[PDB]
Structure 1
Amino acid sequence: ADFEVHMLNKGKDGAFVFEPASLKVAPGDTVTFIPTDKGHNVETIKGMIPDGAEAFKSKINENYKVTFTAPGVYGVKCTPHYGMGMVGVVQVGDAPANLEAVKGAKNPKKAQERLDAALAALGN
C-alpha cells in the first residue's frame, strides 16, 4: 500500500509540519514524502528506528518514496526544521517492539512535543 505525507510551512499544528505527523502502515508499504512547500526534506532521526532498519535522508524538495519493511516505530525529521519541531512518526505493523526506546529518545524541545503527541495519537 502507498501512503502520502506532505511537508508544509504551516498547518494545524503550527509552523513547519509533516501532515499527517503520525501514520500506521504495514510491513512492505511505501510512504511518499511530498514537498508541498519548498525548503523541506525527510530524514530518519538517529536512534529512533527499529532493529535492523536502514537510515535514510532525502534531498531538499525531493518527492521521496520510501518502502518500510522492518517492523517498529520510526521517528523522522526535516533536517533544517528539526529544531523548530518538524517531525513525524511512522509505525510499521502492530505491537512495535521499540516503543519505549523511541519514547525515551532525546530531541529538541519543539520536536519532542510533537513526537510525544504523534506517539500518543498512534495509541502508544
Structure 2
Amino acid sequence: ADFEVHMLNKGKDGAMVFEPASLKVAPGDTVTFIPTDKGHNVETIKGMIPDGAEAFKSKINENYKVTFTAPGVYGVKCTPHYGMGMVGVVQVGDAPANLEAVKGAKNPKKAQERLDAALAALGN
C-alpha cells in the first residue's frame, strides 16, 4: 500500500503540520511526504526509530517516498519547524518494540504534545 502525508503550513491541528500526523502501515508499505506547502522536509527524530531502521532526512521541498521495512514506531519531524511542533508518527506493523525509547525521547514542547496525541491515536 502506498500512503501520503502532506506537509502543510496550516491544517486541522493548526500551524505547521503533517497530515495525517498518525499513520499505521504494514511492513513493505510506502509513505510519500508531499511538499504541498514550500519550506518543509521530513527527518526521523532522535530516539524515535526502531531496530533495524535507517535514519533519514529529506531536502526542503522534496517529494520524499519512504519504503518502511523495519517494524516499530517512527517519529518524524520537519527540521525547521520541529520547535513549532511539525511532527508525525508512522507505525509499521503491530506490537512495536521501540515504544519505551519513543515515548522517552526528548522533544520541544509543541512537538511533544503533537507526538503524544499521534501516539495515542495509534492506540499507543
**TM-score interval, normalised by the smaller of the two chains:** over 0.9
Structure 1 residue runs of 4+, over 3 Å off?
Answer: none
For 2:115 and 2:103, the matched residues in 1 are separated by 8
What is the SS of the residue equivalent to 1:28? coil
Contiguous gaps of at least 5 residues in structure 1: none
For 1:100 and 1:55, the matched residues in 2 are separated by 18
What is the SS of the residue equivalent to 1:119? helix
Give TM-score scaled by structure 2 length. 0.98
Structure 1 match to 2:45: 45
Deviations 1:58-104 (A, max 9, x none): 00000000000000000000000000000000000001111122111
Tell me the number of residue pairs that the alignment of Structure 1 and Structure 2 aligns: 124
Give TM-score scaled by structure 1 length. 0.98
Instruction: State the superposition RMSD in angstroms.
Output: 0.5
For 1:52 and 1:38, the matched residues in 2 are separated by 31
Contiguous gaps of at least 5 residues in structure 2: none
Most deviating of 96-105 and 23-32:
96-105
Deviations 1:1-58 (A, max 9, x none): 1000000001111100000000000000100000011000000002110011100000
For 2:43 and 2:105, the matched residues in 1 are separated by 16
Native 8 Å contact 2:46 2:105 kept in 1: no
